[PDB]
Each structure stands twice: as C-alpha cells, then as structure tokens.
Paper text:
We present here the high‐resolution crystal structure for McrD from a human gut methanogen Methanomassiliicoccus luminyensis strain B10. The structure reveals that McrD comprises a ferredoxin‐like domain assembled into an α + β barrel‐like dimer with conformational flexibility exhibited by a functional loop.
Residue numbers in the entry:
A (entry chain B): -9 to 130
B (entry chain A): -18 to 129
C-alpha cells in the first residue's frame, strides 16, 4: 500500500511540528561507572554529526534483596567528577541512560554504527541501541 | 543533466531514510509522549504529575530522567555531612511508596497505540497546564531498534 497521508513525525500538521534532530539512545544492561561514562562520552563526541550527549541516573534506586540492608535502597553512590572534552561534569548517580543528539536524520545510520563499535568495546555486559524521532505538540 | 535525476525524493516523500534499512532497524510499535518541564521538578510536583498521568487512558508505563542529588553535602573542613534519607524523597503514586532520586527533567509516557496518541496528549496537556505553571513542552517519540 502506497501511503498518501501525512506522518506528523516527518511533516507539519495542525497539531504537530517535526523535531529535526533525532536521538541515538543507549540502554546499557548494567549501570555505568564514572570511568565508563567518561570514556563513552569522550569517544561519542568524536563521532561525526554528534551534537550533544546527555546522561541520566535511574529515577528509583536499587533495592537490597538479601544480606545487610534487605528491604531498603542501596547506599547512595558518591559524587564523582569526570572530564568530557575539557569540561568537568558532576555525576551524582551511576548512569543508566545515554541520549545522543545527531545533527541530521540522513546520517543516523552511519552514526549508530560508529556508536555501536564504541559500545562493543566499553559495554561488554551488553546494551541496546535505538533511534528516536520526535514531533513537537503545537496545537493550532 | 538536470531533469533526468532519479525520483526517490518524490517516491519516498515523507519517509525517514534509515527506516528503509529493515536489515538493521526494527520499528518499535509503541510511541511515547514526552513531557519536558521548563524547570527540574521537585519531588512534590513529580508525585502530583505521576498520579495524574497514570489515570490517562492508554498509558502503559511511565519513566523519568533528570538530575541526581547528593546524599552528602558539606562546606566545612571535614567530609560531607549525610543528608536525611540519603537525599532521596519518598513519593506515593497510586498507593505505592516509591523512593525518588531525581529532579525530573523528562517524563516518558508510553501509549498503547499510535492511533490514540492525539487524545492522550490532549489529556496530558491539560494536566501539565495545571501542574507546571512555569511552562513545559510536549513531544511524541517513535523508536527503532538497531539490530544489525
């Protein structure tokens, strides 16, 4: 079937305006240490067409299921400082998500292959990569 | 040879190119509505927002991202002083007690079907108008898994 409608992810509608820049999303199978985060961000910023890299800790801590502290959250991690392309970044939490903004939809495929090669080396415990494409709600 | 170029710009109009590489990318059926508050949310506002969002029809799951907060703080010669509850806050969402450890900057609301997103985003917009007076932006996201 040859589509004849309008997709709000790729064209303006009366309710949506496409966000030009996609994300490459990294979902590691284990949280990232400060050191891993530092190496990952430095390497990813060297990939052509990467505009910015953002990170997040988890919203909800890990709960202790056995031993001392059972039933309670793990002890909160300590603050760490990393150096990304000469800028100091303070980490309050182990990193569970990475968001990589790419400067053009057309180069996503190449960018994600490059990022995949980095992750193969740095995230031996496994990970998943996704492309996110967005549209802004702008009614009327 | 203007005039005799190939016509992929017409044939593929409105399609994102990477999506045609089905050897490498698998479409994710379920979209998300994203809430981007203009300020990082307090635990109190996060709690209110999550309670209301979980009542919107067709919401499947809700995730959050944002900025961590220290569990130790100090301005003296010694080590940091520990913050009560390790700096985290307990919130109550639909009867569940949840330890929150982010100032929230992005809410990810998974919707069960692209076809119901319009009505869902209208309900979420009404919530945000009420709960986020400092302003916010809403977006929809569609995902593709890289599976080379």
């Amino acid at each position: 079937l040859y589509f004849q409608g309008i997709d709000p992810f790729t064209m303006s509608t009366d309710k949506f305006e496409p966000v030009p820049l996609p994300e490459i999303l990294i979902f590691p199978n284990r949280l990232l240490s400060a050191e891993t985060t530092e190496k990952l961000l430095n390497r990813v910023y060297d990939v052509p067409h990467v505009r910015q890299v953002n990170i997040s800790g988890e919203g909800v801590p890990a709960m202790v299921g056995s031993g001392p502290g059972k039933g309670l959250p793990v002890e909160h991690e300590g603050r760490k400082v990393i150096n990304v392309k000469g800028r100091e970044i303070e980490l309050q939490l182990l990193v569970g998500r990475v968001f990589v903004e790419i400067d053009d939809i057309d180069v996503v495929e190449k960018a994600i292959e490059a990022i995949d090669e980095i992750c193969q080396e740095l995230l031996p415990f496994g990970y998943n990569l996704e492309v996110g494409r967005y549209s802004k709600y702008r009614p009327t």
